[PDB]
């Protein structure tokens, strides 16, 4: 019957789900739990470069808040 | 025959036909695979009298061709001209 085509569709669906799920999870893992910073324009890259310098650990995803202003 | 009501409706709608009335899979309407014995009839030559083979011998009635001309008035055609066909009245145009 037609519903016997579903198992292959389900397997195909799972495989197509993995790349998107894996990319999202790897991004959080490599950016301290946040989305990967998107730098489409020079301004955004400038801010990211300043974040790297400001971090103190050479990681632009390590944020510094009021605790760092004296 | 085991299709649920929803599936029957779905394929009926998609095809635009009531497919359940003329299914292409066969079920119980077919003839039984065991049948009562037959009792076949005999032909017109199964008689005990007035049945001499010479009076019903097709092969011996064949004759050699009729020689019309050999090298040993109105014009004619092989047959009357063919009558023109009529349009169908069941459905003249498809």
């Amino acid at each position: 019957m037609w519903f016997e085509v579903l198992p292959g569709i389900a397997v195909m669906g799972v495989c197509l789900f993995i790349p998107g799920m894996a990319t999202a999870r790897i991004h959080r893992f490599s950016n301290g739990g946040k989305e990967k910073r998107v730098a489409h324009y020079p301004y955004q890259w400038y801010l990211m470069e300043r974040d790297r310098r400001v971090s103190g650990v050479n990681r632009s995803y390590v944020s510094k808040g009021l605790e760092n202003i004296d | 025959a085991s299709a649920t009501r929803f599936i029957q409706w779905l394929r009926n709608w998609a095809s635009g036909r009531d497919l359940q009335a003329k299914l292409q899979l066969r079920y119980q309407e077919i003839s039984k695979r065991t049948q009562p014995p037959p009792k076949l009839p005999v032909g017109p030559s199964h008689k005990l009298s007035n049945n001499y083979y010479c009076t019903r011998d097709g092969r011996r009635e064949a004759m050699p061709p009729s020689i019309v001309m050999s090298s040993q008035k109105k014009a004619v055609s092989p047959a009357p001209p063919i009558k023109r066909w009529e349009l169908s009245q069941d459905e003249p145009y498809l």
Partner: protein
Amino acid sequence: MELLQVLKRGLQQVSGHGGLRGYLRVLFRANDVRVGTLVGEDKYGNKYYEDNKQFFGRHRWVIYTTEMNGKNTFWDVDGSMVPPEWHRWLHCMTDDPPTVKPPTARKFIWTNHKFNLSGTPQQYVPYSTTRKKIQEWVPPSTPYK
């Protein structure tokens, strides 16, 4: 809702095959999990089933034995394993199974059915069944000459 009834029917098939193990056995041996009425069983272990609500062609089937004539047929099965008395019913040449309409017994009919033996040491090898046509002169065994 019918979609709920369909699941019950499919779930019933697991019990109709005597649990998940029996269900998975028929799924992997025959690729079909339908449950039918046991029409009968032949002396080699083949089991014959019918379900007359199935369409013509799918309404009779055999689950082949797992061993026949000393051969392991758990995975290797073939249509030639069906013995002649069941062959007629399985192919729908008759309505009556041999349980109901037994075949006529003869003293020369094989008691043990054989499947296709090609490619095995029991295969058939052709030969001429007639004897030598010309008898040759045999010279004498003594020197008289």
